[PDB]
């Protein structure tokens, strides 16, 4: 399925393009490396043709999962453990999982707790990073005008 011209989503680097299929030699054999161009830090990631699904290279989302993550973002549930260390560990695990609904849960919990209390600079950086990957994912998914993706993010945050 991975041809030149896609827009695939890495686990926690964001949505990236493809431009070539490298046949770079490993053990005297030409494993089909595919290249990536993710623009948050202009790093190029090259992965083997079959271990991408093992490491979690996930395709773009363009169906009722958009409504699913919208109702996840506008869900009434907000619960965290008592200690900030375990709460941060659980949110970091859900962030590193690389799932859109889980990242939506992370940003709704962090945005609710920041508009209620205001926690910390480290979780502020975490919320900025997770909001960046969610906004970039949906803006390259629906092709829906990035930063007007931020306006529709404001709409679903207002709920």
């Amino acid at each position: 399925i991975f041809k030149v011209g896609d827009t695939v989503v890495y686990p926690h680097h964001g949505a990236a393009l493809v431009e070539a299929i490298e046949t770079r030699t490993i053990k005297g054999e030409q494993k089909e490396y595919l290249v990536l161009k993710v623009a948050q830090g202009d790093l190029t990631v090259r992965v083997p043709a079959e271990n991408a699904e093992y490491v979690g290279v996930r395709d773009v989302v363009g169906q009722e999962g958009l409504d699913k993550v919208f109702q996840v973002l506008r869900a009434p549930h907000t619960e965290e453990p008592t200690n900030w260390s375990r709460r941060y560990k659980a949110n970091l695990e859900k962030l590193a999982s690389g799932d859109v609904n889980k990242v939506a849960e992370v940003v709704r919990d962090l945005w609710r707790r920041d508009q209620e209390r205001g926690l910390s600079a480290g979780e502020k950086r975490m919320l900025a990073k997770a909001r960046q990957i969610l906004v970039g994912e949906l803006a390259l998914a629906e092709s829906t005008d990035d930063a007007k993706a931020e306006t529709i993010l404001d709409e679903v945050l207002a709920a």
Partner: protein, 49 residues
């Protein structure tokens, strides 16, 4: 030294070179060579010779 220290603490699949590399000891080494060394001297100019 700090690259091979922080390489193992934070997890795999999340690290990048820009989070691995800390250029502060390199730039401090260059600055502490060019200042406060006895081989980087003030240029002795009274005349061209």
């Amino acid at each position: 030294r700090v690259v091979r220290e922080r390489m193992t603490t934070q997890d795999v699949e999340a690290i990048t070179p820009q989070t691995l590399i800390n250029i502060r000891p390199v730039v401090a080494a260059i600055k502490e060579f060019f200042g406060t060394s006895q081989l980087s001297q003030f240029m002795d100019q009274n005349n061209p010779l």
